[PDB]
Amino acid sequence: RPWQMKDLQAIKQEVSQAAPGSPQFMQTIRLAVQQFDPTAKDLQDLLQYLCSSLVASLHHQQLDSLISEAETRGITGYNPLAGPLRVQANNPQQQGLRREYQQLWLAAFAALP
């Protein structure tokens, strides 16, 4: 049950005025992420739709650092012999990795301003 075009259109329109990482944007994006239960691929699509290449790159770097610390510590469900967290989160049998990816994503995007 992935999102459709209308959901993305509403998500972008409702937060057109606000700035990335504002409380309003964080509310709406967090609700979307917690409601649709998407993988990393869909999150990348959503970010490409919402913010430009500059904000995309900044979030990419911040999320790289956050994932770096998180999975360098060692995580309950992460096994580094199978692939990067971006790929484990895309397997529907690793929901723990998917939820960790979602939370790192939202925190990274919130850490912009």
Residue numbers in the entry: 13 to 125
Which statements did the authors publish about this structure?
The retroviral structural protein Gag forms the immature protein shell of nascent virus particles. All retroviral Gag proteins contain three canonical domains: matrix (MA), capsid (CA), consisting of independently folded N-terminal (CA-NTD) and C-terminal (CA-CTD) domains, and nucleocapsid (NC). During immature virus particle formation, these domains function in membrane binding, viral lattice self-assembly and viral genomic RNA (vgRNA) packaging, respectively. Our results show that HTLV-1 uses a distinct CA-NTD arrangement to form the immature Gag lattice and that, in contrast to other retroviral structures, the CA-NTD is the key determinant of immature HTLV-1 assembly.
To gain insight into the immature architecture of HTLV-1, we used cryo-ET to visualize mammalian cell-derived Gag-based VLPs. The CA layer exhibited a regular organization; hence, we used subtomogram averaging to obtain higher-resolution information for this layer. However, to account for the observed heterogeneity of HTLV-1 Gag VLP shapes, we applied local C2 symmetry during subtomogram averaging. The resulting maps had a CA-CTD layer that was resolved to a lower resolution than the CA-NTD layer, which we predict is because of heterogeneity caused by flexibility of the CA-CTD. In contrast, the CA-NTD did not show increased heterogeneity. Therefore, we used both domains as independent species in a multiparticle refinement using the software M34. This approach yielded 5.9-Å and 6.2-Å resolution maps of the CA-NTD and CA-CTD layers, respectively. The CA-NTD establishes lateral interactions that form two basic building blocks shaping the lattice: a CA-NTD trimer and a CA-NTD hexamer. The trimer is formed by interactions spanning residues in helices 4 and 5. Similarly, the hexamerization interface involves helices 1, 2 and 3 of two neighboring monomers (annotated I and I′ in Fig. 1e,h).
